[model samples]
Target: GTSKLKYVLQDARFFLIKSNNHENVSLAKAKGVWSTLPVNEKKLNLAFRSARSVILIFSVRESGKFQGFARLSSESHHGGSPIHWVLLGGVFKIDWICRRELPFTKSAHLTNPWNEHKPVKIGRDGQEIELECGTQLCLLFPPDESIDLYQVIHKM
Candidate 1:
């Protein structure tokens, strides 16, 4: 008899901000550069409004990393606000195996769903930003079937 395994998928959203006023170029060229695909207008607007100073919002999924999309235009400009230029970037989605018991790692201690702690920091192209809310964790499978699961962790 074939064994049955059940699993669930979860999603989380984070933003990536970039400076230098090259939001359009950064986002347009993001395809094959960072994400596999390009971001759309609606998603780009969302990131533009929510994100600060050249930020990107990634929709983390449960399977693995997925193609992302983005959009850019001079029309989207930033004022004196710290986050200048409201260009849109691709929708980056990452998937991973779910787990029952939380994985033990030094990075694990940095995030806590119950506590609502800050997101981890990640940097690129001489820029840095943080992952805000909209992050989640899900269970992929049960360990009894000789499989492992995992959760969603965020960083700057």
Candidate 2:
């Protein structure tokens, strides 16, 4: 019961933070165990409902990218024309642009290879590397990964 209650309170707080744009620092500073109170619950629920509209807009914007790509390809191939090549070219251009921008695609900053100097490897060989907390924050904000945030909100 305690753990379940803790989860619900955490979820409600998280919802409130997103809904109200209330910074984490402010929530942390609030007096009392305010997260579990009835008044806060009512406020959170109302805010949650209002925030749902914004979330939906976010989902649509996220899905729009894929949908836009699909529509473009569909239109290009409508007449079974040789536009498959055009679609491939477009995809390649996108891939090139993304590759240039994405941090992971670049080589590690350190010149020393694993053979010369081993870094603390956290994951199994070939497994996806887990990001450090700061990196995760950077991934979620600053550059602003809206799709990833949408996925995380659903997870909560």
Q: List ranges where model 2 is wrong by over 4 Å.
A: 1-100, 103-107, 110-126, 130-151
Q: Candidate 1 — which residues are off by over 4 angstroms?
A: 1-13, 16-32, 36-44, 54-104, 112-156
Per-residue lDDT of candidate 1, residues 65-138 (tens digit): 21121212211332322322243333333222211222222133334332335332222221222322223221
* TM-scores of all predicted structures: 0.21, 0.18
Query: In model 2, what is the error at residue 101, expressed in angstroms?
Result: 3.8
Please tell me which predicted candidate would have the highest TM-score against the true structure.
Answer: 1
Q: Best-fitting candidate, measured by lDDT?
A: 1
Local distance difference test, each candidate = 0.28, 0.20
RMSD of each predicted structure = 16.0, 20.8
Residues 83-147, candidate 2, lDDT per residue (tens digit)? Answer: 21100111100100000112222223312232233221211211211123212212221222222
TM-score, cand. 1? 0.21
Q: What is the lDDT of residue 60 in candidate 2?
A: 16
Q: What is the lDDT of residue 93 in candidate 1?
A: 30
